[PDB]
Ligand binder design. Structure first.
Ligand SMILES: Nc1ncnc2c1ncn2[C@@H]1O[C@H](COP(=O)(O)OP(=O)(O)OP(=O)(O)O)[C@@H](O)[C@H]1O
Ligand SMILES: Nc1ncnc2c1ncn2[C@@H]1O[C@H](COP(=O)(O)OP(=O)(O)O)[C@@H](O)[C@H]1O
Ligand SMILES: Cc1cn([C@H]2C[C@H](O)[C@@H](COP(=O)(O)O)O2)c(=O)[nH]c1=O
Ligand SMILES: [Mg+2]
Ligand SMILES: [Mg+2]
Ligand SMILES: [Mg+2]
Ligand SMILES: [Mg+2]
Ligand SMILES: [Mg+2]
Ligand SMILES: [Mg+2]
Ligand SMILES: [Mg+2]
Lengths: 189, 187
């Protein structure tokens, strides 16, 4: 059965911090956990490709999608099948926010690509660490871009209000962790 | 104006040879020409990575699509915009034949991915160099290659106004002369 959880937010919003704290927290409860990440959980060498100068946004998304396809097939679905809690530090929503709202690619196309790439796999909960855009720190990742991405993430959360849990990324680390834990307690068990 | 042409077929069907001969013919006529190829015309690192990695068909297609997206935008469209005849040794049909018919991915999905990746750019003519896998120059493993060969033939019979199918086992010069005869009305 398993449980699929993701962390999302701008660069520097505390995703990795919270994903790792959550993994350790759940491991301490005796739960089998698999901690993974994008980009690179599927095809580690995609990280080299993604640094290529002057990439079209289309090519950028297609690279993230290639990694995502491998990631879902070889890592996430097998983890879930073994009954693990699988936590991914970034997932599809990162592409929707960055390549969609940030770069301007059409969301329906992103979703059509993803439908095969992800085999339709959706997280049960997505913890969005909402960070002011000026605090964030690929090419052209400036303030205008980060404002679009930040608001994009908030739009995705309003559209799927049961899946997304929106948290103020500027709260103390331990307060955010307790909030994440509270949202999880009824799901585990 | 610009004119976009592609060559397709199995590895060892004579694509590079005929692409070279076609560009030479065009050069002899004083017609500006650009020769290119996939994979690697957009992102060389995709070609070299996939030399030594086995991926799911979906991931493979998506990497080839990233390459193609760069190839179209950075190489092909600018060549066409300059009025060149651009000849690509492999294009979208390669992914449809290999990842679609060969490895089983659904063609409508492949085509929806490609719609943005290629900006809808389609060749005016595609020369398919057809031969059985056992005739490609340079039991159970041959099944994949027969799916690809048959897939190419399926693509060709669906778009007879775009594909020209040639017997790849003919002598080189004769194939080249056939390509020239098909191309002459379009210059
Ligand atoms: N709640 C917080 N308050 C203040 N600083 C934090 C908080 N959480 C994490 N940090 C610090 O912010 C920085 C970025 O955190 P982290 O690497 O977890 O973010 P991220 O979202 O994973 O970034 P990236 O997108 O670059 O991977 C680190 O220096 C980290 O210690
Ligand atoms: N019509 C032909 N007859 C005989 N040999 C050929 C012919 N066309 C190409 N060759 C030779 O066959 C091999 C494969 O040709 P090549 O153009 O590299 O095919 P591809 O690019 O499709 O793999 C090369 O060694 C080439 O010299
Ligand atoms: C997973 C993913 C990340 N990104 C960006 C966020 C970061 O700037 C960069 C790498 O992610 P990371 O810094 O969290 O490892 O890639 C996208 O633009 N789209 C995606 O789909
Ligand atoms: Mg954020
Ligand atoms: Mg991080
Ligand atoms: Mg995707
Ligand atoms: Mg997510
Ligand atoms: Mg072959
Ligand atoms: Mg060749
Ligand atoms: Mg494509």
């Amino acid at each position: 059965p398993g449980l699929f959880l993701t962390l999302e937010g701008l660069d520097g919003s505390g995703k990795t911090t919270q994903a790792r704290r959550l993994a350790a927290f759940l491991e301490a409860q005796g739960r089998p956990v698999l901690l993974t990440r994008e980009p690179g959980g599927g095809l580690p060498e995609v990280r080299s490709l993604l640094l290529t100068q002057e990439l079209s946004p289309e090519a950028e998304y297609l690279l993230f999608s290639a990694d995502r396809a491998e990631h879902v097939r070889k890592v996430i679905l097998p983890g879930l099948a073994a009954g693990k809690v699988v936590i991914s530090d970034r997932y599809l929503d990162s592409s929707l926010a960055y390549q969609g709202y940030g770069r301007g690619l059409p969301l329906p196309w992103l979703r059509e690509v993803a439908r095969e790439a992800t085999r339709g796999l959706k997280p049960r909960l997505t913890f969005l660490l909402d960070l002011p855009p000026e605090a964030a720190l690929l090419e052209g990742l400036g303030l205008e871009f980060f404002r679009r991405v930040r608001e994009g993430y908030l739009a995705l959360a309003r559209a799927e209000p049961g899946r997304f849990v929106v948290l103020d990324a500027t709260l103390p680390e331990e307060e955010i962790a307790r909030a994440i834990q509270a949202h999880l307690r009824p799901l585990l068990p």
